[PDB]
RNA sequence: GGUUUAAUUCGAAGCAACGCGAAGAACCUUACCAGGCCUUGACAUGCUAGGGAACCCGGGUGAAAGCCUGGGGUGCCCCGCGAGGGGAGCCCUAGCACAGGUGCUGCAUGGCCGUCGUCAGCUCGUGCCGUGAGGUGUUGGGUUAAGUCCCGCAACGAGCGCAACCCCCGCCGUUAGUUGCCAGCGGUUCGGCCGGGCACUCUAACGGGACUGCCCGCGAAAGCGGGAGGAAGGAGGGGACGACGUCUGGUCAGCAUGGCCCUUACGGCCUGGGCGACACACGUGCUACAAUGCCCACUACAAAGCGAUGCCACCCGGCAACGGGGAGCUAAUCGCAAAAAGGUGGGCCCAGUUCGGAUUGGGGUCUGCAACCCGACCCCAUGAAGCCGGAAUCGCUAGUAAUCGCGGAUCAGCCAUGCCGC
RNA sequence: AAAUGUUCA
């Protein structure tokens, strides 16, 4: 029950409230399965390097958009107030699916 | 290869009669990386060499790349303004290379229809005597005697 | 005919088929990334400045 | 720490320093005077020392300038007898001009 | 027609993102514009108090946005006002709330943005067609770098025939990843044209 | 025969399907 | 390229122009042509005065644009009553100051790029030499991928480069269990699907591992040769990264910018055309000439990516393309897939053929207002040149070449046989 | 023992 999926670009600010997040949850009762590393998802574009006409000679590019999985097994009221409010995120993104 | 002597690949055994040849030879057979469809074609090639002769294939084989390899050859030699034919020994390295390749190169010039067939038959015709390949290697051979005049420079 | 362009494409004018991207830094019409709505020259400008979130040299 | 890579690269380092040095350390302000034994081996010390108004007692023999040199012992530039007399008693008059002393120094090699 | 953005090469290491805020492929193309027409109008109004870098950051559907200035005094004054009004614009071209901290400079000129500038602007002064260089890479120097370049490029002095005048002090190692090597352009415009400008300002390295 | 259309490689080539290459 | 054309747009010009800008020309895009229209203008900042003013729907004309015409409205403010009157956007006309130019010059420029060349080089500080330009250092021997290192030496050091620091791939570990699995027993509608389980695999995070460290040999040393161990060595395999500079290199048509130039037009709008022309020349490619091949049925084994007015299972009509229905999927959970070459069975039997598919007629489908110029597919019928290519000429040293298929950006659709990737 | 093998801001 409850879970709750983070994407981000960095994967270190990403695993970082990754964890803030169980830590928090537990430090409540509650369950928690680990953050499970899901496949990340790459976008690549690759660009002429220059304005006018050079075909041949360009620079690859990419956004790694990276993804983190925690559920929290046994949730209640006190596993809420916590991770409904305490936040952390500032390139980083959260769904909560329950 | 300006550094140093090149330093030749070290083949995989025959999964059949083992032997490094045979793969050196299938290997020659095999275009486009589509082996196994080549590694088949020299095996398939018995029916040709087995109740055709009874001699077992594999000696066979080994018997027509000794009498399809050559032992000498013309290069062209960079004179001024000259370039001749220049006799020259050829390298035990060679001889098998060269070997295989008109072995194989002599059997795709046959007209039997059937690549299986083709080969076998120029390994068997090779196997001692006639043969496209050995009259390929026979004239390799002509050369370095019909210019046995410009040997006086070798390099 | 630059900003003439630029305008007239933002603008609706008819239907769905006239319209275009067409890069939102310069004018460009052509190489522009419906993902960053920027032109193959912006992309790299911005992206080598560190303004792109995310994204950086490739590398693999 | 250090990168046993550089480790090399510096303890190779020291190695060519400590023996192109060791000795020259105890320099402090150049010297008040140069000693060398073969003004023409060592034609550059004196051009030097000479350029920087530095005394320059050598002890050459036949095969150098003797107008090169302030202070002269002329004698044989080769043996290491005739060099270890020389050098010896020349450092047995400093220390006695500042203090004791004795013995003779540990100077004999081999002599052949 | 060679050497690749000192900044874009580091990036990922040594150096930091201009503007850090995740994004979905169904907003972060807009999230774009915003960041940018953001930037626009900073650039042009604090440009009097010479602002180098503009971090944005978005958090829940927010926006941060941190001017780092040599002077603050300029975008606030020597008493407490102004600024007051840039909020009130951020918002007045993007219907949102957002906040705008100011920052300051260890040293000023030992950011390349603002020492590719100030003394870049005696260029647009008529003067020091060289030493204007020379001076600003003793500055770097002096404030204690470990190496500084400053580069000019276009009708120097006003000629006819484009020329090139660079600095050269101190180490930079362009090749460098671990180096941390600040950079800056400038862009100056004068009557003869465009000339510009580059900084490279290296620190500490590991 | 990858520019003939009438055929297993030829709409393979063409990224079609038809009478001569069903979606399975 | 050239030649045509009302226009066929402009640039690029040996290598380093020519599947280049173009990572998507039916109208849009477009910069070109013809014809019809608008002028403070498609938009920017403001100033004056009549007035009107947020907005929304029609009628006429017309190809559209445009022009003409008729329908309707005060939250702000004064206590001033209100119907007298001022005002804020803002909308309009008229005038003013200005807008616009893809018009010129890369030989006034910035910025970015190409290129020599990932070549191993290019310099500086003090010292010494020479009247001086300059030299030495950095000439020499050996060694290296390397101005890499070693040994020499009037030089001793240092900088920009080389290398290393960053990413990917190779072996292993720790952390982590809606992907993985009888791996172990259990039940099974015999699908890991259900309990169950983190061991495998895997996903991903920062760590380990390698360095000529060890043995033998040669050597003055650097280093070279060889052997062991090891997943891996002697730079392990690829990337990213391209020094002072050279090309008056490339780009004023991405952008920016000095100067020159046009402002009832060299600016703007619209419909239609054109950029797709065709006696010819060249570049890059695709499909081939076939039996190591082709065709058909069946049956396997990937990787990397992409998806909500999107990918679209599964049904059903149709021979098809598609069309109706319609589940799941915010996607390691659904699907675009299925990979192809391979394997197996059958067919063809050396022929311009069941090789090859051009070309042409005809019948349909789909996107879009619209496919005459000028789209892509499907189906029937045609079925061309080509059975190996002159002088010449290009690519590649290994998981490379060769060959086979898959994905993506752009994108309604697509002229992609291109490009970047697997 | 390279037969020869021109020109151009
Ligand atoms: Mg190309
Ligand atoms: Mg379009
Ligand atoms: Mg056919
Ligand atoms: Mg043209
Ligand atoms: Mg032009
Ligand atoms: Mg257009
Ligand atoms: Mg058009
Ligand atoms: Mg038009
Ligand atoms: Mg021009
Ligand atoms: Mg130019
Ligand atoms: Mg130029
Ligand atoms: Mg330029
Ligand atoms: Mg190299
Ligand atoms: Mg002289
Ligand atoms: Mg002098
Ligand atoms: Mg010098
Ligand atoms: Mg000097
Ligand atoms: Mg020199
Ligand atoms: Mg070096
Ligand atoms: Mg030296
Ligand atoms: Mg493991
Ligand atoms: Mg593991
Ligand atoms: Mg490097
Ligand atoms: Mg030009
Ligand atoms: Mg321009
Ligand atoms: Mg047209
Ligand atoms: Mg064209
Ligand atoms: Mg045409
Ligand atoms: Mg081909
Ligand atoms: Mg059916
Ligand atoms: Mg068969
Ligand atoms: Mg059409
Ligand atoms: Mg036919
Ligand atoms: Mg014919
Ligand atoms: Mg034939
Ligand atoms: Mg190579
Ligand atoms: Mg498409
Ligand atoms: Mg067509
Ligand atoms: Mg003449
Ligand atoms: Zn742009």
Known sequence: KIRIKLRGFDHKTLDASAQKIVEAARRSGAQVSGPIPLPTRVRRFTVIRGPFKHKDSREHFELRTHNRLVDIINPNRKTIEQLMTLDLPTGVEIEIKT | ?155 | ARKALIEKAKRTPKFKVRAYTRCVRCGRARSVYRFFGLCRICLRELAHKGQLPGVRKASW | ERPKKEQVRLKHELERLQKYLSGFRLLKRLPDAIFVVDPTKEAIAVREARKLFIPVIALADTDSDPDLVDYIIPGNDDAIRSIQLILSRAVDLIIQARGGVVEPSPSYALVQ | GNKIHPIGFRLGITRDWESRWYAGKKQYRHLLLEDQRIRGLLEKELYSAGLARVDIERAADNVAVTVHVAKPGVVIGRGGERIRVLREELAKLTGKNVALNVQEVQNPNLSAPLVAQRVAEQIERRFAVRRAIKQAVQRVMESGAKGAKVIVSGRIGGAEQARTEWAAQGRVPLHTLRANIDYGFALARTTYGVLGVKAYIFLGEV | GKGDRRTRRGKIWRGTYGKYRPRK
């Open chain 2, 1 to 155: 290869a300006r550094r140093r002597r090149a330093e030749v690949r070290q083949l995989q055994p025959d999964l059949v009669y083992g032997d490094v040849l045979v793969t050196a030879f299938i290997n020659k057979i095999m275009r486009d990386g589509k082996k196994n469809l080549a590694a088949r074609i020299f095996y398939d090639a018995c029916k040709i060499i087995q109740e055709k002769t009874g001699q077992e294939p594999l000696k066979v084989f080994k018997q027509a790349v000794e009498n399809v390899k050559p032992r000498m050859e013309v290069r062209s030699r960079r004179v001024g303004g000259a370039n001749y034919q220049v006799p020259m020994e050829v390298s035990p390295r060679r001889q098998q290379s060269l070997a295989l390749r008109w072995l194989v190169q002599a059997a795709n010039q046959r007209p039997e229809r059937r690549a299986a067939v083709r080969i076998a038959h120029e390994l068997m015709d090779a196997a001692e005597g006639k043969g496209g390949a050995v009259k390929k290697k026979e004239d390799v051979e002509r050369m370095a005697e019909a210019n046995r005049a410009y040997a006086h420079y070798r390099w």
